[PDB]
Design an enzyme around this catalytic site. Structure first.
Site, PDB file in Angstrom:
ATOM      1  CG  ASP A 160       6.355   9.104  14.549  1.00  0.00           C
ATOM      2  OD1 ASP A 160       7.285   9.740  14.097  1.00  0.00           O
ATOM      3  OD2 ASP A 160       5.088   9.470  15.130  1.00  0.00           O
ATOM      4  CD  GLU A 189      -2.377   1.500   2.713  1.00  0.00           C
ATOM      5  OE1 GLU A 189      -3.160   2.523   3.010  1.00  0.00           O
ATOM      6  OE2 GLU A 189      -1.875   0.835   3.731  1.00  0.00           O
ATOM      7  CG  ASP A 245       6.010  12.413  16.796  1.00  0.00           C
ATOM      8  OD1 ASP A 245       6.833  12.308  15.987  1.00  0.00           O
ATOM      9  OD2 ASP A 245       4.909  12.210  16.905  1.00  0.00           O
TER      10      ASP A 245
HETATM   11  N1  ATP Z   1      -4.819  10.678   8.665  1.00  0.00           N
HETATM   12  C1  ATP Z   1      -3.802   9.768   8.659  1.00  0.00           C
HETATM   13  N2  ATP Z   1      -4.224   8.680   8.071  1.00  0.00           N
HETATM   14  C2  ATP Z   1      -2.935   7.848   7.956  1.00  0.00           C
HETATM   15  N3  ATP Z   1      -1.852   7.727   8.430  1.00  0.00           N
HETATM   16  C3  ATP Z   1      -1.574   8.924   9.270  1.00  0.00           C
HETATM   17  C4  ATP Z   1      -2.559  10.048   9.338  1.00  0.00           C
HETATM   18  N4  ATP Z   1      -1.997  11.128   9.887  1.00  0.00           N
HETATM   19  C5  ATP Z   1      -0.789  10.638   9.830  1.00  0.00           C
HETATM   20  N5  ATP Z   1      -0.546   9.559   9.745  1.00  0.00           N
HETATM   21  C6  ATP Z   1       0.851   8.706   9.743  1.00  0.00           C
HETATM   22  O1  ATP Z   1       1.439   9.046  11.075  1.00  0.00           O
HETATM   23  C7  ATP Z   1       2.903   9.090  10.383  1.00  0.00           C
HETATM   24  C8  ATP Z   1       3.628   9.893  11.497  1.00  0.00           C
HETATM   25  O2  ATP Z   1       2.924  11.050  12.488  1.00  0.00           O
HETATM   26  P1  ATP Z   1       3.740  12.247  12.413  1.00  0.00           P
HETATM   27  O3  ATP Z   1       2.638  13.396  12.780  1.00  0.00           O
HETATM   28  O4  ATP Z   1       4.558  12.236  13.741  1.00  0.00           O
HETATM   29  O5  ATP Z   1       4.364  12.388  11.185  1.00  0.00           O
HETATM   30  P2  ATP Z   1       5.892  12.528  10.594  1.00  0.00           P
HETATM   31  O6  ATP Z   1       6.051  11.970   9.141  1.00  0.00           O
HETATM   32  O7  ATP Z   1       6.677  11.634  11.650  1.00  0.00           O
HETATM   33  O8  ATP Z   1       6.348  13.858  10.868  1.00  0.00           O
HETATM   34  P3  ATP Z   1       6.892  14.881  12.104  1.00  0.00           P
HETATM   35  O9  ATP Z   1       8.302  14.952  12.082  1.00  0.00           O
HETATM   36  O10 ATP Z   1       6.052  16.066  12.297  1.00  0.00           O
HETATM   37  O11 ATP Z   1       6.724  13.706  13.305  1.00  0.00           O
HETATM   38  C9  ATP Z   1       3.101   9.988   9.442  1.00  0.00           C
HETATM   39  O12 ATP Z   1       4.246   9.289   8.595  1.00  0.00           O
HETATM   40  C10 ATP Z   1       1.855   9.408   8.568  1.00  0.00           C
HETATM   41  O13 ATP Z   1       2.178   8.262   7.719  1.00  0.00           O
HETATM   42 MN    MN Z   2       3.711  10.722  16.012  1.00  0.00          MN
HETATM   43 MN    MN Z   3       6.758  11.706  13.720  1.00  0.00          MN
END
Ligand code: ATP
Ligand code: MN
Ligand code: MN
Ligand code: ZN
Length: 382
Positions: A107, A42, A109
């Site tokens: 992940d 996916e 943050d």
């Molecule tokens: N609405 C959503 N539906 C599906 N997956 C989502 C959704 N919102 C966020 N995600 C997934 O959550 C993951 C991590 O969340 P996050 O906000 O920490 O993003 P990130 O890519 O790690 O950026 P950041 O550096 O701001 O943390 C993203 O990589 C994304 O694939």
């Molecule tokens: Mn997160």
């Molecule tokens: Mn993140």
């Protein structure tokens, strides 16, 4: 932060001459030893205006190049490998389209550290607080490598406020949600939300994982906690540390703190005082449990938990762009983890400027070299 009107013209060129498609396909094809493995993956494209599409799959590398260059997606997310082709999930019987395999992801943050950070807050980051991620990578990676035996770990700058880890061992890709939950529990010490003040509690006997993680933190604690964050500067800050320490010793500390002059001396004092507190009056056992609870509560990695449990959870692809900073989600050179500067990470605008003055012409090249080293280690294990 960034001004997002330039993004489309930048994305067109980035997906045309800069995105490392060959290495990307090597990765998610995993050698081509399992049938339909790339074709059952996916992808989720996020377009302009935060419109995103799910269950996008592709036949081969060229198919991927084409549809990415046709949509120029703002953001790319990797999902799970499914039973059938994701882009055909409507033709399949209800209940037969199920996620089957996906890498074990993490992940991290920086926002989850606002309670123990004083320089920044929310999505902000600076060199003073970035050491947390460094230690995070050190702690988790070590446990992933030694306590679990995972050989193929890819660390990626999330583009803004933290990092990601893709674990790609073949048997790890097969793990159910249950095992992933268990792994996250093994790796978690900081429990409780904003409701609780003291978020770390250690048992009397110390598990090797806790001892080793503490020893990792003991390498950085002086530089991070006592100088760059000054967690013991004055009453405003040190009362936050006293909030997680027994009260019967508060007085002796406040006194000894005011009579001291900086965070170094006050920390040395706290250490002695905690190693003389008696938790249990039966035994005369004293130890650094409080000292350790402090260092863990302020430095131990906090993981976004629900990211790791779900088999079908999407995570931002490596080398995808973060549409709120322009930064590219670049891999992290593990052999240089302490040297990683999130502010030297190239933006899409910046490398498109470099190109006009192939990806090895730009500052994206060393990051691709990191990715290829990860890929060649995947190839050797086959
Ligand atoms: N609405 C959503 N539906 C599906 N997956 C989502 C959704 N919102 C966020 N995600 C997934 O959550 C993951 C991590 O969340 P996050 O906000 O920490 O993003 P990130 O890519 O790690 O950026 P950041 O550096 O701001 O943390 C993203 O990589 C994304 O694939
Ligand atoms: Mn997160
Ligand atoms: Mn993140
Ligand atoms: Zn900061």
């Amino acid at each position: 932060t960034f001004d997002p009107t330039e993004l489309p013209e930048l994305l067109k060129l980035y997906y045309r001459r800069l995105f490392p498609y060959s290495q990307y396909y090597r990765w998610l094809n995993y050698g081509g030893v399992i049938k339909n493995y790339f074709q059952h993956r996916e992808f989720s494209f996020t377009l302009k205006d935060d419109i995103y599409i799910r269950y996008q799959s592709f036949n081969n590398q060229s198919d991927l190049e084409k549809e990415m260059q046709k949509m120029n997606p703002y953001k790319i997310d990797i999902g799970a490998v499914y039973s059938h082709r994701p882009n055909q999930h409507n033709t399949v019987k209800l209940g037969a389209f199920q996620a089957q395999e996906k890498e074990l992801v993490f992940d991290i943050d920086m926002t989850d550290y606002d309670d123990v950070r004083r320089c920044c807050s929310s999505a902000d980051i600076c060199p003073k607080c970035w050491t947390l991620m460094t230690m995070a990578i050190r702690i988790i990676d070590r446990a992933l490598k030694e306590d679990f035996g995972f050989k193929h770990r890819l660390w990626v700058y999330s583009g803004r406020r933290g990092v990601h880890c893709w674990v790609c061992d073949e048997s790890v890709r097969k793990l159910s949600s249950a095992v992933r939950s268990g792994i996250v529990e093994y790796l978690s010490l900081v429990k409780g939300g904003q409701d609780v003040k003291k978020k770390v509690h250690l048992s009397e006997k110390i598990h090797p994982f806790i001892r080793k993680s503490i020893n990792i933190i003991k390498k950085y604690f002086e530089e991070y906690a006592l100088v760059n964050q000054d967690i013991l500067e004055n009453k405003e800050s040190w009362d936050k540390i006293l909030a997680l320490v027994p009260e019967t010793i508060h007085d002796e500390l406040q006194q000894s703190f005011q009579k001291s002059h900086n965070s170094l001396q006050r920390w040395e004092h706290l250490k002695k005082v905690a190693s003389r507190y008696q938790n249990n009056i039966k035994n005369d056992k004293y130890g650094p449990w409080l000292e350790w609870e402090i260092m863990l509560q302020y430095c131990f990695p906090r993981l976004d938990i629900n990211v790791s449990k779900g088999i079908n959870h999407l995570l931002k692809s490596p080398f995808s762009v973060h549409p709120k900073t322009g930064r590219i989600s670049v891999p992290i050179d593990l052999q240089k983890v302490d040297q990683f500067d999130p502010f030297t990470v190239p933006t899409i605008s910046f490398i498109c400027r470099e190109l006009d003055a192939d990806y090895k012409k730009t500052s994206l090249a060393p990051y691709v070299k990191v990715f290829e080293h990860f890929l060649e280690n995947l190839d050797k294990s086959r």
